[PDB]
């Protein structure tokens, strides 16, 4: 479940969010998936974790 | 369109199909030379197809006009989908008739609870995949801004509104993007985004067109 | 704070440490009973630690005051981090002295290029993890709105501004959140978020305090 653009708050723990846009991005490793209704769809995951995944 | 109905041939004369080798988005004809769609539908080599019903069969009323210019909104935010509106100019003016007609821009924003018509060639299944060939229609009310933000906390801007049913079952889906949301004969919304299709508490989100009439008029007057 | 320096004991008398069994965020004292921090730093059972230098040794100038009330901004957006500001009321009024003093709220917003002071007990390594115990300081200029949005396309709101260096090496980091960004003696920023620490083209983003003077004044006047 990689992530290339990860933004975190500077708190303890940090609150991190992945801003990647993918044509699927709706893994089971994403609780809240948001997609445009186009072909292909542009999907983003607005989940908030305390970490960042490895890049892609 | 999930849980909708077959519109009937050419009963939505402002609905257009955007084709780049296949239908990838919808659009709305606002005059003989300009189409309004979603900014996230942008791609090169767009062919605008007017007067379409069955998008897979030439039925004799189609007008296939290539785009000469696409103009994404200057403040379109692909990260948040804010300002998700795009103008498409046709290489040649279309022949406006009964089956190919423009839709009027709003002079005032629509209120919550207004019934609107949402149409498109998008997926008709909430769980699965089935793409229709004829145009599907859906009558859906505009939801309050508060309930829209309640469905998508922190994601709804002043340029978006929700429409549909919080109990799910009726919604727009993949393939409907850029299509019209017409309320009282005015183009009030553009099919934008959502979480799944026809899911409970996940209504479709639409670009609030009434906030862009000024930019739309000035852009087409200078292009 | 990455690429900074040791402030010196109590040279930042408005700097606060928020403790919930450990240091988790910073804050700024704006009067004897109120602290300004970041909304994402919210948690229950906050203890406010004033007069701190070394946060692991009682040095004789500290004041430990429990939070009586926390007030997250009414429009704080945990997804976009817009309106990332929080008011914390002290259970008892702190005694103000040379080592414990309040910081002034801004009368006008600071301009780009203004050198500001950023401080906190956050991580000091850009690639690694080493947390200091004494307060670290960093002088950093405010960056323009254009360059801030250029670093984070589609994510900088009118309530945020970037500060630091596009070449990296100097920035705030994990543990500095809620801390002050003071420019010309006025609290202009709150340590909010970023992409990593001290990374090239990834400067720190801060809450634009000047857009909240009205809310801050009326809230503490009625609480
Ligand atoms: Ca056809
Ligand atoms: Ca101490
Ligand atoms: Cl960090
Ligand atoms: Cl308010
Ligand atoms: Na008090």
From Swiss-Prot, chains B, C:
<feature type="disulfide bond">
    <location>
        <begin position="25"/>
        <end position="41"/>
    </location>
</feature>
<dbReference type="GO" id="GO:0004252">
    <property type="term" value="F:serine-type endopeptidase activity"/>
</dbReference>
<dbReference type="InterPro" id="IPR001254">
    <property type="entry name" value="Trypsin_dom"/>
</dbReference>
<dbReference type="InterPro" id="IPR009003">
    <property type="entry name" value="Peptidase_S1_PA"/>
</dbReference>
<dbReference type="GO" id="GO:0005615">
    <property type="term" value="C:extracellular space"/>
</dbReference>
<dbReference type="InterPro" id="IPR018114">
    <property type="entry name" value="TRYPSIN_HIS"/>
</dbReference>
<dbReference type="InterPro" id="IPR001314">
    <property type="entry name" value="Peptidase_S1A"/>
</dbReference>
<feature type="disulfide bond">
    <location>
        <begin position="116"/>
        <end position="183"/>
    </location>
</feature>
<dbReference type="GO" id="GO:0097655">
    <property type="term" value="F:serpin family protein binding"/>
</dbReference>
<feature type="binding site">
    <location>
        <position position="177"/>
    </location>
    <ligand>
        <name>substrate</name>
    </ligand>
</feature>
<keyword id="KW-1015">Disulfide bond</keyword>
<protein>
    <recommendedName>
        <fullName>Serine protease 1</fullName>
        <ecNumber>3.4.21.4</ecNumber>
    </recommendedName>
</protein>
<dbReference type="GO" id="GO:0007586">
    <property type="term" value="P:digestion"/>
</dbReference>
<comment type="subunit">
    <text>Interacts with SERPINA1.</text>
</comment>
<feature type="binding site">
    <location>
        <position position="52"/>
    </location>
    <ligand>
        <name>Ca(2+)</name>
    </ligand>
</feature>
<dbReference type="Pfam" id="PF00089">
    <property type="entry name" value="Trypsin"/>
</dbReference>
<feature type="domain" description="Peptidase S1">
    <location>
        <begin position="1"/>
        <end position="221"/>
    </location>
</feature>
<feature type="disulfide bond">
    <location>
        <begin position="109"/>
        <end position="210"/>
    </location>
</feature>
<feature type="active site" description="Charge relay system">
    <location>
        <position position="40"/>
    </location>
</feature>
<keyword id="KW-0222">Digestion</keyword>
<feature type="binding site">
    <location>
        <position position="62"/>
    </location>
    <ligand>
        <name>Ca(2+)</name>
    </ligand>
</feature>
<keyword id="KW-0479">Metal-binding</keyword>
<feature type="binding site">
    <location>
        <position position="54"/>
    </location>
    <ligand>
        <name>Ca(2+)</name>
    </ligand>
</feature>
<keyword id="KW-0720">Serine protease</keyword>
<feature type="binding site">
    <location>
        <position position="57"/>
    </location>
    <ligand>
        <name>Ca(2+)</name>
    </ligand>
</feature>
<feature type="binding site">
    <location>
        <begin position="171"/>
        <end position="172"/>
    </location>
    <ligand>
        <name>substrate</name>
    </ligand>
</feature>
<dbReference type="GO" id="GO:0097180">
    <property type="term" value="C:serine protease inhibitor complex"/>
</dbReference>
<feature type="active site" description="Charge relay system">
    <location>
        <position position="177"/>
    </location>
</feature>
<feature type="disulfide bond">
    <location>
        <begin position="7"/>
        <end position="137"/>
    </location>
</feature>
<feature type="active site" description="Charge relay system">
    <location>
        <position position="84"/>
    </location>
</feature>
<feature type="disulfide bond">
    <location>
        <begin position="173"/>
        <end position="197"/>
    </location>
</feature>
<dbReference type="InterPro" id="IPR033116">
    <property type="entry name" value="TRYPSIN_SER"/>
</dbReference>
<keyword id="KW-0732">Signal</keyword>
<keyword id="KW-0865">Zymogen</keyword>
<dbReference type="GO" id="GO:0004175">
    <property type="term" value="F:endopeptidase activity"/>
</dbReference>
<dbReference type="InterPro" id="IPR050127">
    <property type="entry name" value="Serine_Proteases_S1"/>
</dbReference>
<feature type="binding site">
    <location>
        <begin position="174"/>
        <end position="175"/>
    </location>
    <ligand>
        <name>substrate</name>
    </ligand>
</feature>
<dbReference type="InterPro" id="IPR043504">
    <property type="entry name" value="Peptidase_S1_PA_chymotrypsin"/>
</dbReference>
<comment type="similarity">
    <text>Belongs to the peptidase S1 family.</text>
</comment>
<keyword id="KW-0964">Secreted</keyword>
<dbReference type="GO" id="GO:0006508">
    <property type="term" value="P:proteolysis"/>
</dbReference>
<feature type="disulfide bond">
    <location>
        <begin position="148"/>
        <end position="162"/>
    </location>
</feature>
């Amino acid at each position: 479940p990689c992530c290339d653009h990860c933004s975190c708050t500077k708190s303890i723990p940090p609150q991190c969010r992945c801003t990647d846009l993918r044509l699927d991005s709706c893994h089971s490793a994403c609780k809240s998936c948001i997609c445009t209704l186009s072909i292909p769809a542009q999907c983003v995951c607005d989940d908030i974790d305390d970490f960042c995944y490895e890049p892609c | 369109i999930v849980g909708g109905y077959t519109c009937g041939a050419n009963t939505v004369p402002y609905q257009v199909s955007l084709n780049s080798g296949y239908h990838f988005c919808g659009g709305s004809l606002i005059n003989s030379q300009w189409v309004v769609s979603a900014a996230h539908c942008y791609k090169s080599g767009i062919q605008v197809r007017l007067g379409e019903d069955n998008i897979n069969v030439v039925e004799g009323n189609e007008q296939f006009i290539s785009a000469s210019k696409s103009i994404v909104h200057p403040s379109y935010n692909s990260n948040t989908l804010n300002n998700d509106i795009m103008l498409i100019k046709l290489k040649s003016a279309a022949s406006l008739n009964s089956r190919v007609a423009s839709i009027s821009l709003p002079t005032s924003c629509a209120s919550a609870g207004t019934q609107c018509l949402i149409s498109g060639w998008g997926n008709t299944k909430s769980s699965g995949t089935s793409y229709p060939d004829v145009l599907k229609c859906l009558k859906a009310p505009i939801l309050s801004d508060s309930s829209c933000k309640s469905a998508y906390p922190g994601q709804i801007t002043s340029n978006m509104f929700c429409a549909g049913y919080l109990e799910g079952g009726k919604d727009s889906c993949q393939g409907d993007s850029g299509g019209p949301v017409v309320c009282s004969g005015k183009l009030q919304g553009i099919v934008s985004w959502g979480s799944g299709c026809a899911q409970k508490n996940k209504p479709g989100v639409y670009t609030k067109v009434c906030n862009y009439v000024s930019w739309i008029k000035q852009t087409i007057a200078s292009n």
